[PDB]
Amino acid sequence: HMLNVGATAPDFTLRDQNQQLVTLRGYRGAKNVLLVFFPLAFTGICQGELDQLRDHLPEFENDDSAALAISVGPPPTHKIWATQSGFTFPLLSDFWPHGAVSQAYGVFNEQAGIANRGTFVVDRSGIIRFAEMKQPGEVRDQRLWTDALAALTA
Template sequence: MQELIAVGDRAPDFTLPDQNNRKVNLVGLSADRRVLLVFFPLAFTGNCEGELALIRDRLPEFENDSLTTVAISVGPPPTHKVWSSAQGFLFPLLSDFWPHGAVAQQYGVFSERHGYPLRGTVLVDRDRTVLFADVAEAGAPRDATVWERALRLA
């Protein structure tokens, strides 16, 4: 795993398909709001489902006039479509499928050993400056305080 992107770094732009196969890019997302990037290992897994359900259940905190939130994993758009429909996730689930994990690698949250991103949380300002960055160890859930620390800066 590469080193986690640092606070103060410029967040790399990316363009990825969402669960509806629409192209989403960081430059467009950050044009008028801060962006919370929520990297997760895999759809249809317990910890990931619980974390994204928290976002779903508290959506006004994660999606408002000053902040937008996207979740990113290596799963393909059709998988994300089925999962997001079943779970009622109304925020974008972006597919970092090919090149496999390239965006997660740029942000320093990709586990080569596992072949998927770890639970990374990165808050990006409108000028693409990283305001917050955290990553959980492989197999570990996101620290319970991560959401509050990131949202406080949003």
């Protein structure tokens, strides 16, 4: 099942949309990390969620916080989507092995082969301090994300 608050966040090294390696442990001791798992690029609900993250980026990518969007797509998919959508934050490929990081966080839909709408905040110690999992057909409330992030600055 989904990892809950108090668990150590599984570490990972994934390619971003520009093929650079991004590792979760690299933020430890420096920033709180918002992990935004999403099902599929070029779909309507995903578009809306990541458009909203784009529109409010300074709340998620600053001196205290970092945001990483994760899905099973490979980098060329995430690159074209990011370019066409104006996304400048990292989109990470859980592509091969397929959904392995999703599976480690307990947010992989084993029937569909896609991550659910899982969201986590990982504190500077690497412990999960916010956890949620919505289904692909549901929409998340991003005020919950900013509120969790805010509580780990002060």
